[PDB]
Design a protein around this ligand. Sequence first.
Ligand SMILES: [Mg+2]
Ligand SMILES: [Mg+2]
Ligand SMILES: [Mg+2]
Ligand SMILES: [Mg+2]
Ligand SMILES: [Mg+2]
Ligand SMILES: [Mg+2]
Ligand SMILES: [Mg+2]
Ligand SMILES: [Mg+2]
Ligand SMILES: [Mg+2]
Ligand SMILES: [Mg+2]
Ligand SMILES: [Mg+2]
Ligand SMILES: [Mg+2]
Ligand SMILES: [Mg+2]
Ligand SMILES: [Mg+2]
Ligand SMILES: [Mg+2]
Ligand SMILES: [Mg+2]
Ligand SMILES: [Zn+2]
Lengths: 24, 116, 98, 127, 155, 60, 78
Amino acid sequence: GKGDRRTRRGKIWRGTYGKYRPRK
Amino acid sequence: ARIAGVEIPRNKRVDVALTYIYGIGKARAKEALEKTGINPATRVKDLTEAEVVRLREYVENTWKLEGELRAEVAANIKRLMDIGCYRGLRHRRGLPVRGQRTRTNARTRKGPRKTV
Amino acid sequence: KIRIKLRGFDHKTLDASAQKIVEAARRSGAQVSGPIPLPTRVRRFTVIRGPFKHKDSREHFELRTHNRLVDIINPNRKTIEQLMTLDLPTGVEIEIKT
Amino acid sequence: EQYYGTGRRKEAVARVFLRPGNGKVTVNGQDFNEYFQGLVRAVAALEPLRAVDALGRFDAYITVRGGGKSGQIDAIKLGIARALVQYNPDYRAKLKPLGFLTRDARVVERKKYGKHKARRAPQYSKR
Amino acid sequence: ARRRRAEVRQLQPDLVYGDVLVTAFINKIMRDGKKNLAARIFYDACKIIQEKTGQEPLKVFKQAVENVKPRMEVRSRRVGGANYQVPMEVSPRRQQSLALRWLVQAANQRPERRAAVRIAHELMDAAEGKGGAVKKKEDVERMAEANRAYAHYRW
Amino acid sequence: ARKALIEKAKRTPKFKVRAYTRCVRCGRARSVYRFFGLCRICLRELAHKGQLPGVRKASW
Amino acid sequence: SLKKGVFVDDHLLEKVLELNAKGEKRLIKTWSRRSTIVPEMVGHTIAVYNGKQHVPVYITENMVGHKLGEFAPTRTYR
RNA sequence: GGUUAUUCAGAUUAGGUAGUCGAAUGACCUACCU
RNA sequence: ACCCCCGCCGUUAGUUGCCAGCGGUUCGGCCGGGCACUCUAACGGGACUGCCCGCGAAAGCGGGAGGAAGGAGGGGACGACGUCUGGUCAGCAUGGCCCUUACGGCCUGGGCGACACACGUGCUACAAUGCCCACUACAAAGCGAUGCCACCCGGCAACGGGGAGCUAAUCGCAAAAAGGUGGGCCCAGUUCGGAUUGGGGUCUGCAACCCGACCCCAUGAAGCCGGAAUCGCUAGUAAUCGCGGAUCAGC
Ligand SMILES: [Mg+2]
Ligand SMILES: [Mg+2]
Ligand SMILES: [Mg+2]
Ligand SMILES: [Mg+2]
Ligand SMILES: [Mg+2]
Ligand SMILES: [Mg+2]
Ligand SMILES: [Mg+2]
Ligand SMILES: [Mg+2]
Ligand SMILES: [Mg+2]
Ligand SMILES: [Mg+2]
Ligand SMILES: [Mg+2]
Ligand SMILES: [Mg+2]
Ligand SMILES: [Mg+2]
Ligand SMILES: [Mg+2]
Ligand SMILES: [Mg+2]
Ligand SMILES: [Mg+2]
Ligand SMILES: [Zn+2]
């Protein structure tokens, strides 16, 4: 989902990374 | 089995079943598993009885959930209620608490379109 | 050994200014690698044409901030005298570092 | 000895080194069937070699870069025609009519203002 | 448009059989320009052809189109002031185009869970004679002969 | 408050969350690029006058 | 949100500390709804402004972490 | 599903009228004009 | 039509690029070496009904070869005498009118963010050409001195702390996504859908109640591809997929 508030490409759409996304 | 006193998430994934439990979402579901070494794959129609109490009593006693949770949900309102904060008088008229556009939609809290 | 940079807007006065620098250093000193244009970093600015309101038919220009590079090896005595004196800058911002 | 040409398309160029061999085809590392995996278009690129009738008789070291995945393959398609047309005059008299020698002008088109995609207008109305 | 005949798109042949028609079907399956996703889903059902029947997908496809290829159709036309449903011969191209079109549209209607399986169960029921997509062709051929009245406007 | 506000812009006496951008010519309150200190109108006109060096009528 | 340091004006704490220093009244005319309420400042009556005027809004133990504006309407019929 | 009555909410109009058209509710089985 | 982008190649220049040729291989173009080639901009040739065929008076049209590209190859800049007494005294200037202890002037707070509605443009979806998750691979352009932040620790994360390099084809924003391999999922108001809302947190900034974004936990709303009507688009276009910037404290 492009709008699920807890997903892979969920953050790829809102400009952020978060937990569900490999940060540094 | 009858997990949270009344809710009975049978015949379905051990992980997902717990989500259906009120007060227990997806994360708190992966939480009982790693802290009880339970495999997320298996079901509820073929789990050991030990775990029917092991995993159960675990979350039941671990953190707030069930009707008691909702009560707190319902309580935190009465506080914003008795005095009249800007957040509280939103549940009154039933408006949103994000200060969002009431002019356009916002139906989800407003209710179905009442033309008049 | 030494290295000179050549940023600038006009490109006709940036193939000229880098071209004079190539003939003066070679004709009166040791080897000097030719002009090496760096990827022109260009600015772009679109903006609504109308004074008031017309979300279209707008306009936009570009800032051609060029780039050019010449590298000399031998710090000759004739060349450093040729560069110091003989040079025709203009709208070119050079920066030399050893 | 070697055969060379230059494939290019969508700013996704592709150098083409190719000396006669068994059929091995390293390109930006990886074997041919290794890099391009689960993508039907691939088996096409090697068509020029099937036009010359020499599948398992020409190794190839191609250096492709830039552009998307598939666009690459297209650049590969032409680099090989150029490669096997350079060191071979008589292999153009038949490879050209079948068509292989063309840059393929079909580049993405610039997006224009007052539109969303150089073309797709915002939902027209009147109300 | 009005000037020239505005001729067809002469697509590239098949990357497996070397025949134009095959590629055609791919496209109409292809959503969002994913020729790799569709080609597989079509090729997947190609091999689901030699399973249920040692028969070659080449003739199961050739026979799957030519068994839903509508022969004549109802086009509406004005006549100074009226809309008749004139029946008339389809374009060689129009047939293929619609056949191939409906073909796909059947794949979506079916209860089959996996796509290639839908086009598998469909492309067979096509060469057989009966199928959800074949019936949308018997159907348009009906309106054809029923309105046979107004055939006096062949134009 | 169009003069008394173009002047108040050059002041920045209080906190910097008030040093809001402003135009150099017109004193427009919005659509002021930082690279120029200009607003879209003039900066377009001045761009036609060639008085903005390097800048060039874009056409790709 | 101000996790570090509980934001609020100094004139508030000031105009209320001199209030605890001898248990004075409670009347007060503020113009800073942008401020959190000081825990101990219970029982007082801060007449908060709201573009309109000073609402004699009271205070308790519950309404602490909440701001002054929280308890001052800004719009008519709300 | 069909018929009818009404109504405003839209829709077609540059706009209005009317109509067509749509919806709701109760009952029931293209025309003119500015 | 001469203006530029992309379409063919070369001329000029070599810190972009080559186990392609040899030596080390830490088997990493890291070192040595080189610019033929990729690239980088800049200059220039190329397509002109030129050629063969046929119609024709000419103009020209239709067909074939050669060619990267044939009948403006694709795209953009450009938009006439006018029309709409179109738009803007609010970007600015300007005639006239009008205020001139306030129609001018400053702060603080409020308001443009008010909701019983209706319309316009949109995002995201209702899902098995697909939902979630582990690995792996391929872009172009663009910006980065009080800014882009590699590497290491705390944590569930947003974020913070220490700290290397960068006046920027050399350092950073930087996994391009969809996709390739493998997993659970099995048609379910669903592992679809994320609206709504309780409590806990981080960042900017005098100050996030009014009135910010952003995490994690929970709540898992409407919603089975939509009436009448109605819109975009003829090809690298529609659709579909990610990225950057301006704007800017943040948003
Ligand atoms: Mg070349
Ligand atoms: Mg595109
Ligand atoms: Mg600001
Ligand atoms: Mg109407
Ligand atoms: Mg009307
Ligand atoms: Mg009603
Ligand atoms: Mg360099
Ligand atoms: Mg060699
Ligand atoms: Mg050499
Ligand atoms: Mg023509
Ligand atoms: Mg012109
Ligand atoms: Mg007027
Ligand atoms: Mg507004
Ligand atoms: Mg439910
Ligand atoms: Mg409900
Ligand atoms: Mg930015
Ligand atoms: Zn200005």
